[PDB]
UniProtKB/Swiss-Prot annotation, chains A, B:
The keyword Iron applies. Its EC number is 1.15.1.1. Destroys superoxide anion radicals which are normally produced within the cells and which are toxic to biological systems. It holds the Pfam family Sod_Fe_N. This is Superoxide dismutase [Fe]. The gene is sodB. It comes from Pseudoalteromonas translucida (strain TAC 125). Belongs to the iron/manganese superoxide dismutase family. It is an enzyme of class 1 (oxidoreductase).
């Protein structure tokens, strides 16, 4: 059975960019719920003996929604860090310059894609088969994990539950918080 | 251009089922934004002389999302009332009995459809061409308004911004709030 992974930091380690209350609800309730739901759905199908990744890449309906959300949220927590934020570094910093010319241009590009991602969704930084970086948006539970030759490197949850408590309807403010927490170490690990 | 309709009741008239704060944000911010965005999209276009309903029936992309959302929210505010809630009455009450056998069975059926309506969505009570009632779900900005032979009678906003302030992640509690506010007068009006 799948388990809710531990948060990689203290529930108040992302303050004041993402509050303790948001973390307890988002990770403690929302993330957990997907875990419970998936476990409830798999026994009795050809999924109970497969990994989360295998499942997301071979399912649909409720099995996929819950499984993918589990994967998406775990990737999301890793994309944040009390030690992140600021300018990118290492491989990813240069890759960002290679694609967009500058970190700033990349930042405005991603913010534009995220603020305009309609409804419940996710905005991703991915590495394409050609080796370049790019920004893609997914709806609901969809994820680039299912795109062949596409490697997820960083993600930002744009479902309203991810920011409503701290920023209400202002995604731009939420995004400023995201840039203050972005985990470049996780990005680079995923990049290399 | 289009304008934000006034709320059909005092900003605190839905307490304690839906907070004054939720209405301030939901209607004053979210709904309003849909109006400004549309107004910013239609000038010098084939949609500048059209009525709201006409636009939702002949658009896609950004124009559709914004227009339909303006319509859905206006329909939603009308589906609530400080003097609603309780047992259904008139034509709708009897039509409800005709389809589900009982109001309680209907309530459980709608609750089920609403709680499982994945992502940003709407759950609708609609009247079909054969005069019967039924429950349907739409995602993001989709609406029964564009379905031939389908007459919307009541709707519940399931986007997280509709209830996150007052109920956080618990849709069932939000739904109990809905049932204490359901505007049966509006329902019968739409039904007849
Ligand atoms: O896991 C339950 C179902 O979730 C999805 O369907 C629900 O959410 C949809 C919107 O995202 C609604 O259109 C639908 O009516 C709901 O039942 C999923 O598509 C289904 O396959 C799941 O069984
Ligand atoms: O109105 C702007 C656009 O909104 C939608 O597209 C955005 O939101 C989608 C998810 O709902 C994303 O997939 C997409 O990447 C975003 O640009 C709509 O589908 C577009 O036609 C609108 O132009
Ligand atoms: Fe989330
Ligand atoms: Fe809404």
């Amino acid at each position: 059975a799948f388990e809710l992974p531990s948060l990689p930091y203290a529930i108040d380690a992302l303050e004041p960019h993402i509050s303790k209350e948001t973390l307890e609800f988002h990770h403690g309730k929302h993330h957990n719920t997907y875990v419970v739901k998936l476990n409830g759905l798999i026994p009795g199908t050809k999924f109970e003996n497969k990994s989360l990744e295998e499942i997301v890449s071979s399912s649909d309906g409720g099995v996929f929604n819950n499984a993918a959300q589990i994967w998406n949220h775990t990737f999301y927590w890793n994309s944040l860090s009390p030690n992140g934020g600021g300018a990118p570094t290492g491989a990813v910093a240069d890759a960002i310059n290679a694609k967009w010319g500058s970190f700033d241009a990349f930042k405005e590009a991603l913010n534009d894609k995220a603020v305009n991602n309609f409804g419940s969704s996710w905005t991703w930084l991915v590495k394409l088969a050609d080796g370049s970086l790019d920004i893609v948006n997914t709806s609901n539970a969809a994820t680039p994990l299912t795109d062949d030759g596409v490697t997820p490197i960083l993600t930002v949850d744009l479902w309203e539950h991810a920011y409503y408590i701290d920023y209400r309807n202002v995604r731009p403010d939420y995004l400023k918080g995201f840039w203050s927490l972005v985990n470049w170490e996780f990005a680079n690990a995923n990049f290399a």
